[PDB]
Amino acid sequence: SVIRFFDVTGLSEKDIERVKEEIELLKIRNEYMKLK
Amino acid sequence: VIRFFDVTGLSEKDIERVKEEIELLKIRNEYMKLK
Amino acid sequence: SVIRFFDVTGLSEKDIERVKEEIELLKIRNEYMKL
Amino acid sequence: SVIRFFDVTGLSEKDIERVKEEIELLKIRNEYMK
Ligand SMILES: [Cl-]
């Protein structure tokens, strides 16, 4: 897989989860685009 | 403070969106700190 | 189709574009649930 | 103030809340730059 470091200085754990959910939204889109 | 995230398959523009979301959250917190 | 209004006061066209993109991602997630 | 209309077909209530939060983050950024 591929893992990247991000600077999340000052972000709360609730903020982190919002960032994680944004990553998942993008991955879900790519899982649809890859079908064709 | 540095976290790693799995970004498998994310394009270059996808990574940009993630970086911008992070920035938006930092600014909200600096804007809370300039209360 | 379902159309809703949002207060977007002070948002630039580029901020609006970011909102539209977020809506698009949310719709895709609902499609993906159907598989 | 300014409102705009968006097609949100299929979005759940919680989905709509995520959109509203993104708007508010964008508004806060502008309130900070000013
Ligand atoms: Cl991860």
Residue numbers in the entry:
A (entry chain D): 124 to 159
B (entry chain A): 125 to 159
C (entry chain C): 124 to 158
D (entry chain B): 124 to 157
What do the paper's sentences say?
Here, we report a structural analog of the oligomerization domain of p53 from the conjugative plasmid pLS20 of the Gram-positive (G+) bacterium Bacillus subtilis. This transcriptional regulator, named Rco, forms tetramers in solution and represses the main conjugation promoter Pc that controls the transcription of genes 28–74. The simultaneous regulation of the Pc and Pr promoters involves RcopLS20-mediated DNA looping, which is achieved through the binding of RcopLS20 to two operators separated by 75 bp and located near the Pc and Pr promoters, each containing multiple direct repeats of the Rco-recognition element. DNA recognition by Rco is most likely to be achieved through a conserved helix–turn–helix (HTH) domain at its N-terminus, which is followed by a sequence of hitherto unknown function at its C-terminus. Our present results show that the master regulator RcopLS20, which is crucial in the transcriptional regulation of the conjugation operons of plasmid pLS20, contains a tetramerization domain that is likely to be involved in formation of the DNA loop, and that this domain has high structural homology to the tetramerization domain present in the p53 family of tumor repressors.
Crystallization trials on apo full-length (FL) RcopLS20 were not successful, but cocrystallization of FL RcopLS20 with various DNA sequences did result in the formation of crystals. However, structure determination revealed that the crystals contained only part of RcopLS20, corresponding to residues Val125–Lys159 of the FL protein, and no DNA molecules. The asymmetric unit contains four monomers forming one crystallographically independent tetramer. Each monomer consists of an elongated sequence comprising residues Val125–Thr132, which includes a four-amino-acid β-strand formed by residues Arg127–Asp130. This strand is followed by a sharp turn facilitated by the glycine residue Gly133, which is followed by an α-helix comprising residues Glu136–Lys157. The RcoTetpLS20 tetramer consists of a dimer of primary dimers. The primary homodimer is formed by the arrangement of two β-strands from two monomers in an antiparallel fashion and by concomitant antiparallel packing of the helices against one face of the two β-strands.
